[PDB]
Structure 1
């Protein structure tokens, strides 16, 4: 029995459980429970977290756990998913924060009104329990120290005996505001995954996933579901496993993911889908002020693809072209005509066909991603406000012409959007918080009054005749040149490394292997 080490980022419980559950998923022992509500929720959260989890099935999920088989890769792709799914089983955070606040003041009444610092306070009980871990997780400058000041103020009214019950009743009478605000902060704490966890805080989830968690070998003889054994020595969680399965289903690929814990939980950097380093497409930017020969983005990308195809033809392979026809069958049976392309003067007919294909492919991808990004995530729309298409849409509010050029922004000249846009009470807009008005608007224009935002899912069909989808159809049309942003999705689909030089990037050569 070997101890597999989980990253100590504060979510070591979620990391360890991610690893053990990973061996169980590949190991096949959970193929019975796989269609149950719990593992359907697991799948749904996995697809909710990874926009490139393209076929929504467990076939794909087991693929992912097999490809990204580094234990850190596993944590990076599954621990945020388990975290998200765990949130769906918390029940009474109101009572929890009440208990945490009463613990704080109960054990630190004099400490607080004496002006002590947070690190000087008593945060542990007589049995070693953590007295207020969620409160403790909040940032010191932003929240904790101000809270100690506010408690110092309202404690001037505390005219009772110092007991836990008296403190609870006191905080119910005099800190309803404070409790509400603390609830907002803790529920939206972006570093929540780092606050340290006990096993039972996950119990709900684990029961929905049919797994018991064994803490330091203290097993429940009465419990007889499949287990995940966890060692906890110095306030850290590791997972025990048998040597045999250790070597077959963990660390059977190289480490592939270069991304921080926070980046993983936040969704900033998407993970690429498993592939079965790549070929490269190399472009160089030009400006509108100073174009080269004025090529649009789709033309340049298509030329790159054709070069990759012809190269692979010399070595007697059609890999890339095959990948193209799987994306667009309209191109199958064009291999020879493409191979015969004089890239000095390339045939305009064929090239316009290829560009059209590319535009439709990039539409399919952008719409899939936008739909993933409008999915309700408990009030958080940061992934949505980072979307290139939402950025192009919101560029119309403060209408700088450079962001509304018709050749690059699909929404540039949509009259209905410009209407709704110009008819917004801008005084109701909080500066730097235009998103607060823009993301509901967007959602409306994408799904209509027919579907409440909080009900949007990966499956919620966007409303037809929507001005959003109407505007994005402009990328299919040929007066749309496109930008590197669209070429990013094209680079996703064709599995190539897209390298874009600037107008003035220098190239130094060296001799290499």
Structure 2
């Protein structure tokens, strides 16, 4: 197994290496015109201003020129992290349900100016009621969130029931909910928080790939497989010797930025040549 960089989005680093092999080997050629891969191409061009023309020919050229495994991670893992967010269909409902639990269990607490630590964050089964909200930054995000909910709650005109809260927030907190989705899906803590294979499933389905974690393979699945080894928080990607020799590490390492500097995207990668 090839170890992926732990820095940044470690699962995305591993997937980027495995995906690059499948792409450069030609084994995904039948898929490159499908909507998933056109979306990948769009995200690659959005992240890399020197990428031109916008085509899978150019994308393969970039993977062939930046073929050192660390360079692949640096040029492709941010792109896959951005693409993954296009497939987070569930996230709007999830954040609405978190915000609903927060307000339903704490309406008076919030109105009365209590601090985040004083809020009920656990339900009647011991379940976490809003874990993604509570992972936001305490001073930059969670304090302003409580101030914003104090404003919003001045218009609450109903009996306090969970259903009434949920409908109220759907109508009256649309812009707040959109902003919370952006933070939860793309802020630096979200990039670094550690993902499971299932949290990429919408993307990998659209890319016609199955992520195989620790030999846990569905033999009824005839899609291209990216094989991974999950090491508590470390990740290896499996690559046979023939594919390794032909499609990885054929070029010297060229890029010097960190994973988080690569994700930020301010430093341009030079076009090949």
TM-score, structure 1 normalization? 0.43
Contact kept in structure 2, 1:6 and 1:15, CA below 8 Å = yes
Contact kept in structure 2, 1:27 and 1:249, CA below 8 Å = yes
Once the two structures are superposed, what CA deviation does each residue of 1:56-84 show, in whole Å capped at 9, x if it has no partner?
Answer: 33333222212212222111101122122
Contact kept in structure 2, 1:45 and 1:81, CA below 8 Å = yes
Distance 1:215 1:130 in 2: 27
Cα 1:206/1:157, change in 2 over 3 Å: same
Once the two structures are superposed, what CA deviation does each residue of 1:421-466 show, in whole Å capped at 9, x if it has no partner?
Answer: xxxxxxxxxxxxxxxxxxxxxxxxxxxxxxxxxxxxxxxxxxxxxx
Cα 1:42/1:124, change in 2 over 3 Å: farther
Distance 1:53 1:80 in 2: 15
1:206-217 equivalences under 5 Å are 206-217=204-215
Cα 1:173/1:271, change in 2 over 3 Å: closer
Distance 1:218 1:128 in 2: 31
Cα 1:168/1:196, change in 2 over 3 Å: farther
Once the two structures are superposed, what CA deviation does each residue of 1:313-352 show, in whole Å capped at 9, x if it has no partner?
Answer: xxxxxxxxxxxxxxxxxxxxxxxxxxxxxxxxxxxxxxxx
Structure possessing the higher radius of gyration over alpha carbons:
1
The residue that corresponds to 1:132 in the other structure is: 130
Cα 1:273/1:135, change in 2 over 3 Å: same
Distance 1:40 1:252 in 2: 26
Q: For residue 157 of structure 1, report the CA deviation from its aligned partner.
A: 11
Q: For residue 175 of structure 1, report the CA deviation from its aligned partner.
A: 5.9
Q: For residue 24 of structure 1, report the CA deviation from its aligned partner.
A: 0.8
Q: For residue 211 of structure 1, report the CA deviation from its aligned partner.
A: 0.5
Q: For residue 224 of structure 1, report the CA deviation from its aligned partner.
A: 1.5
TM-score, structure 2 normalization? 0.75
Distance 2:123 2:249 in 1: 40
5+ long unaligned stretches in structure 1:
276-513
Distance 2:253 2:30 in 1: 30
Distance 1:114 1:35 in 2: 56
Contact kept in structure 2, 1:80 and 1:264, CA below 8 Å = yes
Cα 1:55/1:127, change in 2 over 3 Å: farther
Q: For residue 22 of structure 1, report the CA deviation from its aligned partner.
A: 0.8
Q: For residue 20 of structure 1, report the CA deviation from its aligned partner.
A: 0.5
Contact kept in structure 2, 1:12 and 1:238, CA below 8 Å = no
Distance 1:63 1:53 in 2: 10
Secondary structure of 1:125's counterpart equals coil
Secondary structure of 1:253's counterpart equals coil
Secondary structure of 2:251's counterpart equals coil
- Count of equivalent residues: 272
The residue that corresponds to 2:33 in the other structure is: 35
Q: CA RMSD for the aligned pairs? A: 4.2
Q: For residue 222 of structure 1, report the CA deviation from its aligned partner.
A: 2.5
Once the two structures are superposed, what CA deviation does each residue of 1:349-407 show, in whole Å capped at 9, x if it has no partner?
Answer: xxxxxxxxxxxxxxxxxxxxxxxxxxxxxxxxxxxxxxxxxxxxxxxxxxxxxxxxxxx
